[PDB]
């Protein structure tokens, strides 16, 4: 019943928490109860995890946002004050939720995949991300599946990382939740098995879907750091 992404061990209980409404999806989010409680273990149970969320130490997306089933999904920059626990959370190679530690420099920003640019009302330029960052007045060349950079103090798009040929990609979807390397090919169809394909250590080639993909940076220079091992 409990999803694979949170690394919920089967030794949990009986009932798994359904994460509520928020910025992110149902399948692409782990709430703060399963984050703090049994992933990096700053609380032991529901009582004291509600106690620390009422003590209000957390600054996910730079705000407190006190709720257990608050769906803090992909790359919501978690920030906890006591000994500066700064965590940007990504996917690992098997679909789970990795939590890469950052510092205050990397915690002063994040990115977002654009989902549509519309001309709704009063002629205002328009961009929404996965976390609903309705940010005002970009360059008019915000294309489909492009990437904006969020200031995390304001909302303003400070940098703009394009979805095009020769940029380091991310994938959230397919049989391939979360791989990196993006250079064998760009095979663009018109709606199905349409993607930029990804390499490996032996430089293999993989197939994914287009809106199940965004850009993280450039091949050889991402400033959004990645862990190792």
């Amino acid at each position: 019943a409990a999803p694979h992404h949170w690394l919920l061990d089967k030794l949990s209980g009986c009932y798994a928490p359904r994460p509520s409404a928020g910025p992110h999806k149902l399948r692409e989010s782990l709430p703060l109860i399963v984050f703090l409680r049994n992933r990096l273990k700053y609380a032991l149970n529901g009582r004291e995890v509600k106690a620390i969320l009422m003590q209000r130490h957390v600054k996910v997306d730079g705000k407190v946002r006190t709720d257990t089933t608050y769906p803090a999904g992909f790359m919501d920059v978690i920030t906890l004050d006591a000994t500066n626990e700064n965590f940007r959370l990504v996917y690992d190679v098997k679909g789970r939720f990795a939590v890469h530690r950052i510092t205050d420099e990397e915690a002063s920003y994040k990115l977002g995949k654009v989902k549509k640019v519309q001309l709704g009302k009063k002629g205002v330029p328009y961009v929404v991300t996965h976390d609903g960052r309705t940010i005002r007045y970009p360059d008019p060349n915000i294309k489909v599946n492009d990437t904006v950079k969020i200031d995390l103090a304001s909302g303003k798009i400070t940098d703009f990382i394009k979805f095009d040929a020769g940029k380091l990609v991310y994938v959230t979807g397919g049989r391939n939740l979360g791989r990196i390397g993006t250079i064998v090919h760009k095979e663009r169809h018109d709606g199905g098995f349409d993607l930029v394909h990804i390499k490996d250590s032996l430089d293999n080639t993989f197939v994914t879907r287009l809106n199940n993909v965004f850009v993280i940076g450039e091949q050889g220079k991402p400033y959004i750091s990645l862990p190792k091992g």
């Binding site: 694979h4 061990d9 030794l11 049994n38 273990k41 032991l44 098997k94 679909g95 979807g173 397919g174 049989r175 391939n176 939740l177 199905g192 098995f193 197939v207 994914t208 879907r209």
Partner: protein
């Protein structure tokens, strides 16, 4: 056709080809020692159990390490225990003599047909078998 996510297609099952015969040979010919216990602390109900099996002591190590790793005593969930614990102690007291289980020699499971005789690297060409030998 199209791509579907599947945890059962990249999940650590890893129990379809573990056989106690093979692991017993690997433990014999490993040349790394094996962390046995002090010799009294392994028998259980003052003897009324077995000693205890190797699967039992690894599972018990997992339960107490999960215990000391996230601070939680388990329960007496009755459907689960009324199946698994009574069936566990009953197969233990039928098959496990002296702390060593002997049910692996009285149970049909083909050793070669899951554990040896590799499947992907089956070498279905003579060129492939010559290259992989040399």
């Amino acid at each position: 056709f199209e791509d579907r996510f599947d945890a059962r297609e990249h999940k650590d099952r890893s129990n379809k080809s573990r056989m106690q015969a093979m692991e017993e040979y690997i433990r014999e010919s490993s040349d790394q020692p094996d962390w046995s216990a002090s010799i009294g602390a392994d028998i259980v109900n003052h003897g009324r159990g077995g000693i205890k099996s190797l699967r039992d002591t690894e599972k018990e190590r997992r339960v107490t390490s999960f215990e000391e790793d996230n601070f939680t005593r388990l329960n007496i969930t009755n459907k689960a225990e009324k199946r698994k614990q009574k069936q566990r102690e009953r197969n233990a007291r039928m098959n496990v003599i002296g702390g060593e289980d002997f049910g692996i020699f009285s149970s049909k499971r083909k050793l070669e047909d899951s554990t040896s005789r590799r499947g992907a690297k089956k070498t279905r060409s003579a060129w492939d078998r010559a290259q992989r030998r040399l």
